[PDB]
């Protein structure tokens, strides 16, 4: 099982200037409940992205795509391609792709499912804009309600699984 987690705005931004335009600490305790003990693989500038206290992100197997030799910032296995990144693989778990959105274009061919947190935050998107993946006809949807964060932002999960 090969899931993709991403969080977007509304609007389907996911990243902005090296980092995430928004701050929702329910999200991240969603991200944390669902990939706690797992393997994620991420993107090469999602892991610069990491601020040092999350980099490598504690209690989950790090494996980081990139196409150079090795990098500066400790903790992470290398990979040269998603499929070495994908197998082997833990038995009874989902390898969670957690992007960024070149990542999550290479995945999204071989995902099984999509862990989406959407965000209502007006963020009209910016010329530099990382954007969420687009989903297809053979993903089959589920949504949450709307809920209140403490910061007064309302979000929501969708829950995606392939046909
Ligand atoms: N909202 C969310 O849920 C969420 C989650 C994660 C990230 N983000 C945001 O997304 C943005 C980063 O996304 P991004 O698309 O710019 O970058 P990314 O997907 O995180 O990383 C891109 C890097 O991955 C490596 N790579 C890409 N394709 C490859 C391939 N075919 N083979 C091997 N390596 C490959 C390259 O690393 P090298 O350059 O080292 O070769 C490339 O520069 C940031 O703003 C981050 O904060 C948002
Ligand atoms: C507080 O910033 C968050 C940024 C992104 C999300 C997030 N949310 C969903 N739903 N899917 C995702 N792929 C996703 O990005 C995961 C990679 C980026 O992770 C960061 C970045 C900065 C600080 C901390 C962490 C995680 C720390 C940990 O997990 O210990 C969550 C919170």
Redesign the pocket.
């Known amino acids: 099982s090969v899931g993709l987690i991403?969080?977007?705005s509304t609007s389907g931004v996911?990243?902005?200037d090296?980092?995430?335009p928004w701050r929702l600490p329910e999200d991240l305790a969603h991200f944390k409940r669902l990939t706690m003990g797992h393997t994620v693989v991420?993107?090469?500038?999602?892991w610069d992205?990491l601020p040092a206290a999350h980099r490598p992100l504690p209690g989950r197997r790090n494996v980081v795509?990139?196409?150079?030799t090795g990098l500066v910032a400790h903790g992470a296995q290398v990979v040269?391609?998603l499929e070495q990144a994908l197998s082997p693989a833990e038995p009874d778990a989902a390898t969670w792709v957690?992007?960024?959105?070149?990542?999550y274009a290479?995945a999204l061919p071989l995902a099984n499912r999509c862990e989406v947190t959407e965000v209502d935050v007006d963020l009209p998107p910016e010329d530099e804009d990382?954007l969420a993946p687009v989903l297809d006809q053979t993903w089959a949807g589920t949504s949450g309600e709307w809920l209140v964060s403490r910061s007064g932002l309302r979000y929501r999960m969708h829950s995606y699984r392939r046909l």
């Open positions: 991403w969080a977007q996911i990243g902005r090296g980092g995430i991420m993107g090469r500038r999602t992205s795509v990139t196409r150079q040269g391609s957690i992007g960024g959105a070149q990542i290479l990382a």
